[PDB]
mmCIF file of all heavy atoms in Angstrom:
data_model
loop_
_atom_site.group_PDB
_atom_site.id
_atom_site.type_symbol
_atom_site.label_atom_id
_atom_site.label_comp_id
_atom_site.label_asym_id
_atom_site.label_seq_id
_atom_site.Cartn_x
_atom_site.Cartn_y
_atom_site.Cartn_z
ATOM 1 N N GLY A 91 12.698 -11.742 10.331
ATOM 2 C CA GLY A 91 12.105 -10.437 10.471
ATOM 3 C C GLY A 91 10.629 -10.485 10.149
ATOM 4 O O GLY A 91 10.247 -10.948 8.996
ATOM 5 N N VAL A 92 9.811 -10.058 11.049
ATOM 6 C CA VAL A 92 8.385 -9.994 10.903
ATOM 7 C C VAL A 92 7.953 -9.594 9.526
ATOM 8 O O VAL A 92 8.605 -8.749 8.874
ATOM 9 C CB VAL A 92 7.768 -9.029 11.858
ATOM 10 C CG1 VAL A 92 8.649 -7.745 11.874
ATOM 11 C CG2 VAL A 92 6.312 -8.719 11.540
ATOM 12 N N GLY A 93 6.934 -10.172 8.928
ATOM 13 C CA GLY A 93 6.338 -9.700 7.663
ATOM 14 C C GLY A 93 7.221 -10.012 6.453
ATOM 15 O O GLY A 93 7.028 -9.408 5.386
ATOM 16 N N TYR A 94 8.143 -11.053 6.581
ATOM 17 C CA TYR A 94 8.854 -11.470 5.398
ATOM 18 C C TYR A 94 8.177 -12.558 4.552
ATOM 19 O O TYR A 94 7.120 -12.393 4.081
ATOM 20 C CB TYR A 94 10.308 -11.741 5.719
ATOM 21 C CG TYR A 94 11.156 -10.457 5.819
ATOM 22 C CD1 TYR A 94 10.480 -9.266 5.859
ATOM 23 C CD2 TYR A 94 12.501 -10.508 5.896
ATOM 24 C CE1 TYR A 94 11.224 -8.055 5.992
ATOM 25 C CE2 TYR A 94 13.237 -9.310 5.994
ATOM 26 C CZ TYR A 94 12.589 -8.105 6.049
ATOM 27 O OH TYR A 94 13.258 -6.965 6.153
ATOM 28 N N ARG A 95 8.822 -13.754 4.473
ATOM 29 C CA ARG A 95 8.206 -14.919 3.834
ATOM 30 C C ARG A 95 8.249 -15.000 2.334
ATOM 31 O O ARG A 95 8.135 -14.033 1.572
ATOM 32 C CB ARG A 95 6.695 -14.979 4.319
ATOM 33 C CG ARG A 95 5.819 -15.848 3.462
ATOM 34 C CD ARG A 95 4.616 -15.089 2.977
ATOM 35 N NE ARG A 95 4.933 -14.129 1.864
ATOM 36 C CZ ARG A 95 5.034 -14.407 0.574
ATOM 37 N NH1 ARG A 95 4.848 -15.627 0.168
ATOM 38 N NH2 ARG A 95 5.352 -13.490 -0.304
ATOM 39 N N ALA A 96 8.460 -16.217 1.835
ATOM 40 C CA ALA A 96 8.531 -16.508 0.387
ATOM 41 C C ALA A 96 7.429 -17.548 -0.093
ATOM 42 O O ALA A 96 6.765 -18.178 0.771
ATOM 43 C CB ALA A 96 9.855 -16.977 -0.030
ATOM 44 N N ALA A 97 7.302 -17.734 -1.416
ATOM 45 C CA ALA A 97 6.136 -18.390 -1.955
ATOM 46 C C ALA A 97 6.406 -19.623 -2.866
ATOM 47 O O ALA A 97 6.055 -20.700 -2.573
ATOM 48 C CB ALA A 97 5.242 -17.432 -2.662
ATOM 49 N N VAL A 98 7.002 -19.287 -4.034
ATOM 50 C CA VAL A 98 7.076 -20.252 -5.157
ATOM 51 C C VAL A 98 5.676 -20.716 -5.556
ATOM 52 O O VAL A 98 4.846 -21.001 -4.706
ATOM 53 C CB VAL A 98 7.897 -21.517 -4.832
ATOM 54 C CG1 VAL A 98 7.191 -22.705 -5.366
ATOM 55 C CG2 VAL A 98 9.288 -21.407 -5.467
ATOM 56 N N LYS A 99 5.482 -20.757 -6.815
ATOM 57 C CA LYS A 99 4.174 -20.967 -7.371
ATOM 58 C C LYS A 99 4.476 -21.301 -8.876
ATOM 59 O O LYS A 99 3.915 -20.607 -9.739
ATOM 60 C CB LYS A 99 3.341 -19.668 -7.411
ATOM 61 C CG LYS A 99 2.905 -19.169 -5.963
ATOM 62 C CD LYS A 99 2.219 -17.834 -6.152
ATOM 63 C CE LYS A 99 1.432 -17.345 -4.962
ATOM 64 N NZ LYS A 99 2.302 -16.766 -3.795
ATOM 65 N N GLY A 100 5.338 -22.285 -9.077
ATOM 66 C CA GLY A 100 5.777 -22.601 -10.458
ATOM 67 C C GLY A 100 7.235 -22.784 -10.477
ATOM 68 O O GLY A 100 7.830 -23.645 -9.865
ATOM 69 N N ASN A 101 7.896 -21.916 -11.212
ATOM 70 C CA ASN A 101 9.346 -21.854 -11.219
ATOM 71 C C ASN A 101 9.847 -20.411 -10.968
ATOM 72 O O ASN A 101 11.036 -20.023 -11.151
ATOM 73 C CB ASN A 101 9.948 -22.344 -12.514
ATOM 74 C CG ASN A 101 9.982 -21.296 -13.562
ATOM 75 O OD1 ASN A 101 11.025 -21.010 -14.189
ATOM 76 N ND2 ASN A 101 8.880 -20.685 -13.878
ATOM 77 N N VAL A 102 8.925 -19.594 -10.456
ATOM 78 C CA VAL A 102 9.190 -18.214 -10.066
ATOM 79 C C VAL A 102 8.807 -18.011 -8.583
ATOM 80 O O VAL A 102 7.708 -18.155 -8.224
ATOM 81 C CB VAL A 102 8.490 -17.263 -10.964
ATOM 82 C CG1 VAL A 102 8.534 -17.748 -12.434
ATOM 83 C CG2 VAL A 102 7.090 -17.030 -10.494
ATOM 84 N N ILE A 103 9.837 -17.607 -7.780
ATOM 85 C CA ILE A 103 9.560 -17.487 -6.327
ATOM 86 C C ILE A 103 8.973 -16.096 -6.084
ATOM 87 O O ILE A 103 9.558 -15.100 -6.569
ATOM 88 C CB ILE A 103 10.849 -17.587 -5.541
ATOM 89 C CG1 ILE A 103 11.628 -18.843 -5.988
ATOM 90 C CG2 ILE A 103 10.552 -17.679 -4.078
ATOM 91 C CD1 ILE A 103 12.894 -19.130 -5.182
ATOM 92 N N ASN A 104 7.899 -15.983 -5.300
ATOM 93 C CA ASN A 104 7.438 -14.674 -4.896
ATOM 94 C C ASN A 104 7.858 -14.295 -3.526
ATOM 95 O O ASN A 104 7.665 -15.006 -2.575
ATOM 96 C CB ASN A 104 5.860 -14.704 -4.961
ATOM 97 C CG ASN A 104 5.271 -13.397 -4.340
ATOM 98 O OD1 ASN A 104 5.191 -13.293 -3.121
ATOM 99 N ND2 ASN A 104 4.931 -12.466 -5.234
ATOM 100 N N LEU A 105 8.553 -13.125 -3.447
ATOM 101 C CA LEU A 105 9.116 -12.757 -2.143
ATOM 102 C C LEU A 105 8.468 -11.497 -1.615
ATOM 103 O O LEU A 105 8.155 -10.540 -2.326
ATOM 104 C CB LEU A 105 10.580 -12.486 -2.214
ATOM 105 C CG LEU A 105 11.429 -13.809 -2.466
ATOM 106 C CD1 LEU A 105 12.714 -13.465 -3.238
ATOM 107 C CD2 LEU A 105 11.768 -14.400 -1.125
ATOM 108 N N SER A 106 8.165 -11.531 -0.328
ATOM 109 C CA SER A 106 7.700 -10.347 0.423
ATOM 110 C C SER A 106 8.769 -9.927 1.483
ATOM 111 O O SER A 106 9.069 -10.700 2.366
ATOM 112 C CB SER A 106 6.413 -10.596 1.071
ATOM 113 O OG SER A 106 5.832 -9.293 1.489
ATOM 114 N N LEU A 107 9.336 -8.673 1.305
ATOM 115 C CA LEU A 107 10.440 -8.233 2.041
ATOM 116 C C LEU A 107 10.336 -6.840 2.572
ATOM 117 O O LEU A 107 11.310 -6.153 2.819
ATOM 118 C CB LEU A 107 11.714 -8.411 1.225
ATOM 119 C CG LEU A 107 11.923 -9.824 0.680
ATOM 120 C CD1 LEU A 107 13.115 -9.847 -0.238
ATOM 121 C CD2 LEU A 107 12.210 -10.769 1.853
ATOM 122 N N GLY A 108 9.128 -6.349 2.715
ATOM 123 C CA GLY A 108 8.904 -5.068 3.394
ATOM 124 C C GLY A 108 9.209 -3.902 2.473
ATOM 125 O O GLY A 108 9.424 -2.747 2.971
ATOM 126 N N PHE A 109 9.181 -4.164 1.192
ATOM 127 C CA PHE A 109 9.155 -3.088 0.224
ATOM 128 C C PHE A 109 7.737 -2.641 -0.010
ATOM 129 O O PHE A 109 6.861 -2.963 0.805
ATOM 130 C CB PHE A 109 9.778 -3.543 -1.066
ATOM 131 C CG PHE A 109 11.192 -3.992 -0.923
ATOM 132 C CD1 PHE A 109 11.493 -5.397 -1.054
ATOM 133 C CD2 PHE A 109 12.199 -3.160 -0.819
ATOM 134 C CE1 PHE A 109 12.767 -5.815 -0.856
ATOM 135 C CE2 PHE A 109 13.515 -3.520 -0.702
ATOM 136 C CZ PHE A 109 13.806 -4.922 -0.725
ATOM 137 N N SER A 110 7.474 -1.880 -1.053
ATOM 138 C CA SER A 110 6.099 -1.451 -1.378
ATOM 139 C C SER A 110 5.569 -2.289 -2.531
ATOM 140 O O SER A 110 4.830 -1.748 -3.366
ATOM 141 C CB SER A 110 6.056 0.058 -1.621
ATOM 142 O OG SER A 110 6.277 0.822 -0.503
ATOM 143 N N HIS A 111 5.962 -3.485 -2.559
ATOM 144 C CA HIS A 111 5.741 -4.360 -3.805
ATOM 145 C C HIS A 111 6.298 -5.765 -3.572
ATOM 146 O O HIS A 111 7.326 -5.925 -2.894
ATOM 147 C CB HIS A 111 6.438 -3.746 -4.985
ATOM 148 C CG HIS A 111 7.902 -3.427 -4.708
ATOM 149 N ND1 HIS A 111 8.929 -4.347 -4.864
ATOM 150 C CD2 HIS A 111 8.560 -2.284 -4.273
ATOM 151 C CE1 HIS A 111 10.104 -3.787 -4.571
ATOM 152 N NE2 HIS A 111 9.860 -2.529 -4.207
ATOM 153 N N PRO A 112 5.660 -6.744 -4.132
ATOM 154 C CA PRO A 112 6.310 -8.092 -4.068
ATOM 155 C C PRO A 112 7.575 -8.103 -4.976
ATOM 156 O O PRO A 112 7.764 -7.106 -5.589
ATOM 157 C CB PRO A 112 5.262 -9.061 -4.643
ATOM 158 C CG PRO A 112 3.989 -8.242 -4.669
ATOM 159 C CD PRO A 112 4.364 -6.804 -4.907
ATOM 160 N N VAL A 113 8.285 -9.232 -5.024
ATOM 161 C CA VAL A 113 9.420 -9.149 -5.890
ATOM 162 C C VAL A 113 9.415 -10.191 -7.054
ATOM 163 O O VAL A 113 9.998 -9.878 -8.143
ATOM 164 C CB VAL A 113 10.777 -9.323 -5.137
ATOM 165 C CG1 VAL A 113 10.830 -8.291 -3.941
ATOM 166 C CG2 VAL A 113 10.945 -10.723 -4.645
ATOM 167 N N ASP A 114 8.876 -11.378 -6.904
ATOM 168 C CA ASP A 114 8.791 -12.423 -7.941
ATOM 169 C C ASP A 114 10.102 -12.657 -8.693
ATOM 170 O O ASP A 114 10.342 -12.150 -9.766
ATOM 171 C CB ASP A 114 7.712 -12.066 -8.961
ATOM 172 C CG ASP A 114 6.328 -12.156 -8.363
ATOM 173 O OD1 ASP A 114 6.067 -13.164 -7.675
ATOM 174 O OD2 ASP A 114 5.519 -11.314 -8.667
ATOM 175 N N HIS A 115 10.927 -13.466 -8.118
ATOM 176 C CA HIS A 115 12.250 -13.839 -8.769
ATOM 177 C C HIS A 115 11.946 -15.169 -9.523
ATOM 178 O O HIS A 115 11.397 -16.108 -9.054
ATOM 179 C CB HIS A 115 13.309 -14.007 -7.796
ATOM 180 C CG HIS A 115 14.638 -14.300 -8.351
ATOM 181 N ND1 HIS A 115 14.904 -15.344 -9.231
ATOM 182 C CD2 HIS A 115 15.849 -13.591 -8.270
ATOM 183 C CE1 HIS A 115 16.167 -15.294 -9.602
ATOM 184 N NE2 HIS A 115 16.754 -14.255 -8.990
ATOM 185 N N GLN A 116 12.471 -15.175 -10.828
ATOM 186 C CA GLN A 116 12.206 -16.322 -11.723
ATOM 187 C C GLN A 116 13.367 -17.237 -11.836
ATOM 188 O O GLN A 116 14.454 -16.900 -12.255
ATOM 189 C CB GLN A 116 11.787 -15.846 -13.121
ATOM 190 C CG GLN A 116 12.808 -15.021 -13.839
ATOM 191 C CD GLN A 116 12.954 -13.588 -13.187
ATOM 192 O OE1 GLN A 116 11.941 -12.880 -13.035
ATOM 193 N NE2 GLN A 116 14.131 -13.190 -12.943
ATOM 194 N N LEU A 117 13.240 -18.555 -11.386
ATOM 195 C CA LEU A 117 14.279 -19.445 -11.406
ATOM 196 C C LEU A 117 14.833 -19.673 -12.823
ATOM 197 O O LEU A 117 14.087 -19.538 -13.838
ATOM 198 C CB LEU A 117 13.884 -20.826 -10.866
ATOM 199 C CG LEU A 117 13.990 -20.918 -9.402
ATOM 200 C CD1 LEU A 117 15.297 -20.440 -8.971
ATOM 201 C CD2 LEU A 117 12.862 -20.099 -8.730
ATOM 202 N N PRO A 118 16.156 -19.984 -12.935
ATOM 203 C CA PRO A 118 16.744 -20.228 -14.260
ATOM 204 C C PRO A 118 16.541 -21.633 -14.682
ATOM 205 O O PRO A 118 15.767 -22.363 -14.052
ATOM 206 C CB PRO A 118 18.201 -19.911 -14.071
ATOM 207 C CG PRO A 118 18.419 -20.382 -12.615
ATOM 208 C CD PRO A 118 17.099 -20.186 -11.869
#
């Protein structure tokens, strides 16, 4: 889906999913 995409930048993944905000999930 257009405008999605993920990042990772350490051990916390940054997600863009069409909300009004990024999500930043942190790996365990």
Side-chain angles (χ1 to χ4, degrees):
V92 43
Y94 281 13
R95 164 235 73 86
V98 139
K99 292 177 166 77
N101 83 125
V102 320
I103 313 181
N104 169 278
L105 293 151
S106 195
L107 305 170
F109 300 105
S110 291
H111 53 83
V113 310
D114 292 317
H115 185 304
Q116 60 289 309
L117 275 311

